[PDB]
Design a protein around this ligand. Sequence first.
Ligand code: CA
Ligand code: CA
Ligand code: CA
Ligand code: ZN
Length: 304
Amino acid sequence: ATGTGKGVLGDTKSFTTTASGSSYQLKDTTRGNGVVTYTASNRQSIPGTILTDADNVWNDPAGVDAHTYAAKTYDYYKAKFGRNSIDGRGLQLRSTVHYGSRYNNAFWNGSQMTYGDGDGSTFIAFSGDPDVVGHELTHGVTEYTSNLEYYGESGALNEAFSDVIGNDIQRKNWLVGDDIYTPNIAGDALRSMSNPTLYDQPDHYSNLYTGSSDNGGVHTNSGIINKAYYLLAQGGTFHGVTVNGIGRDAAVQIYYSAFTNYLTSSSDFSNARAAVIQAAKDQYGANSAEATAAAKSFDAVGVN
Ligand SMILES: [Ca+2]
Ligand SMILES: [Ca+2]
Ligand SMILES: [Ca+2]
Ligand SMILES: [Zn+2]
């Protein structure tokens, strides 16, 4: 069936649902093994209950966006990368919204995407930014490919790949989480990929966070890798190094191959530089403008 409804930002969209007895479930059986979206009813049991609606016009902005953006992310991976869901074999995509009460985060737990509502002040419902949905689902992609550990540089790479892909899905700007952060302030964000230090992330390896909090800085140090991706795609001169931009299309192919074919669970930033150079060589040639840009983007952020 074709359901309709407003997302967290008030925009009407359509998506696929399933008629089941007297009502419709928020369940799309046409993408892999399914896209299925649940409510946790403001408690913390997951997955919770499949969301239902009597007339297929939905009034659950968070669930509309969780469901729609998971279907769009499914379409994006298959269309862009030839990948069928998280495992490449059609894994069912399960999302739960209204997790907890005023809960200020969202996460991938090894099985499904779970989204808090936010407290209404700092955050609104987290599925409202397709780059956050993209971000969380890409944590499952990483689990099934490089399986990058979630500590230190490995864990920062894990984070950075989730931001590169989430951001690339929407393509609105160089920001992450901007649609759901601080609804009373325009143009800020959880992270910036073009200017990471705006939100207290380092943009160069010489300012790597080396403390133990946050699993050794995994949401901090991703700023360095996000900056390298930005320089590869957009180009720039940074720390004296000029990177000729190769555009998002080519950059995201290079990073996708790098992070799914070449990195492994213990990889650090140096290995990521090697993997990104290799993917650029695979795709454009050993001495191509693209392979040269890949190497310069890492020179620029001080990863040798
Ligand atoms: Ca209705
Ligand atoms: Ca966004
Ligand atoms: Ca804001
Ligand atoms: Zn993450």
